[PDB]
Swiss-Prot record, chains A, B:
Localization (cell): Secreted
Function of the molecule: Primary component of whey, it binds retinol and is probably involved in the transport of that molecule.
Protein name: Beta-lactoglobulin
Main localization, broad class: secreted
Length: 162, 162
């Protein structure tokens, strides 16, 4: 895939704190279709390091339980692009944010041989922000998404979105 | 939705023949999320009757097989609205068509619209028609969808969308 738009001027220190996964999309239906699908992950928090790296706290269904997971994303020459250090190295792209209300990012699933891509719309509060959803859909027009999900407030406040 | 002009003058005789489910959306994620989800149905063909009813031939994953099913949709006072008793739905609404390339329709249970609404973009040929998808998304902006799926040509030509 060709991501055609990452964020200019990204100050990663300002995305610290709590977030909620309002909506997600992926290039393959099977990446997101079930609760236990591989890229079905709910971001809880972003913790920038002083070295300019990014810690990502998320929840994920596994073996019928809601599991917390910590991902360390290492900075690169491009400021909106990070590398996840893991058995298969995976990229995380910050597309856009206003720091105070929404953040749009994508992550690839390199354990898939075939090129795969998931993107999320994160908001600061557990409400459906229509303007953030509009910016998400605008950013998605350039991308080959075949599944899109959106969640309601009860799900945002729940564990693993229930 | 407003009953529109192409909806006032819907001539069902002109929708006869083969169709492909290019994209689908629903109000509840669980209506569409798995292959065996209840409203995960692929329209194959539309057969208008001389009495002005509408036969809908579709495929559906069930008991580990791709099963053919026949739904009889009975006409009503409103020409774009039909009555069914299948998939725990009771109404089918034709939202828009140009007869020759696309048709947009929804199904619901009028007892439980929020929990039962699914809509589809059907095309005449197994290709991704961007203009048809634009009209589908335009019609969906007014609706409380939380899942949207789009299929590729190989899936369109496949059994139960591969």
């Amino acid at each position: 895939i060709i991501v055609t738009q990452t964020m200019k001027g990204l100050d990663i220190q300002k995305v610290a704190g709590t977030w909620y996964s309002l909506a997600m999309a992926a290039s393959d239906i099977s990446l997101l279709d079930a609760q236990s699908a591989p890229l079905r992950v709910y971001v809880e928090e972003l913790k920038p390091t002083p070295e300019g790296n990014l810690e990502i706290l998320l929840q994920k269904w596994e073996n019928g339980e809601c599991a917390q997971k910590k991902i360390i994303a290492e900075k690169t020459k491009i400021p909106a692009v990070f590398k996840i250090d893991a058995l298969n190295e995976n990229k995380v792209l910050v597309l856009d944010t206003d720091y105070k209300k929404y953040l749009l990012f994508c992550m690839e699933n390199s354990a898939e041989p075939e090129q795969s891509l998931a993107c999320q719309c994160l908001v600061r509060t557990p409400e459906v922000d229509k303007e953030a959803l509009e910016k998400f859909d605008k950013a998605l027009k350039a991308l080959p998404m075949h599944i899109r999900l959106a969640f309601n407030p009860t799900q945002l406040e729940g564990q693993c979105h229930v």
